[PDB]
Design a protein around this ligand. Sequence first.
Ligand SMILES: N=C(N)NCCCNC(=O)[C@H](Cc1ccccc1)NC(=O)c1ccc2[nH]c(=O)cc(O)c2c1
Length: 236
Amino acid sequence: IVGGTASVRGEWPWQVTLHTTSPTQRHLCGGSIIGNQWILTAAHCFYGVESPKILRVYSGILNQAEIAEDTSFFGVQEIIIHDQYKMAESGYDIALLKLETTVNYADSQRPISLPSKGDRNVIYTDCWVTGWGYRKLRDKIQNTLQKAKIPLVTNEECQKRYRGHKITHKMICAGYREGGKDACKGDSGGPLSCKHNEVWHLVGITSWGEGCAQRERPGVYTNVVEYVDWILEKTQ
Ligand SMILES: N=C(N)NCCCNC(=O)[C@H](Cc1ccccc1)NC(=O)c1ccc2[nH]c(=O)cc(O)c2c1
């Protein structure tokens, strides 16, 4: 997260850190608890991941230093990638992780509500992007989870910024004209959370962008409300 600040312990309880064990253990992607056995993440995260066996999901984490060999984690039983996905930039950048065991909800780890089809005309003004990613383009994974308030840009405005791409209705963009605040390497799969009527909604999944926090380049997120039927179908 560029131009962000440290989160407080448990202020983003749906936020998970997805690790890989191959060749040595490292953070791979962010993700969100959407159910007892369900993590919503991005599809691009699993490029070259042959088996869900190398994956470890960690919940209730503030700092990466909390993860040692003796730390409990959730095994992955299945990676469900959307069947129309090819790559991040063309959309359908969504994946569900079926956990081996269920998550015991507490103040440190709880699910985030998915937006309803009626909320398609809601004007979200309290949107945050969270992750352990890069604080600059050339950096490293951060110990402490960062947060940044980012305003939603219209699909019409985002399209003018990405003239060589098609920004579809299944995408949502967020950013400042002048830049300085955005997701960066290591934040993908993660939530774009928006507070509406005292309730937090998973509005977007960190997907792609041209660099990180550049002027006139909003970050591009998967628009979750467009996948609530696919989420229902695959979670059955
Ligand atoms: N402006 C925007 N909104 N951009 C959004 C998209 C940002 N892209 C990402 O997050 C990529 C995607 C991606 C995710 C997984 C694999 C390839 C690409 N992540 C990484 O490269 C990434 C991820 C984990 C890492 N683990 C480490 O230990 C050291 C790393 O260097 C490191 C870097």
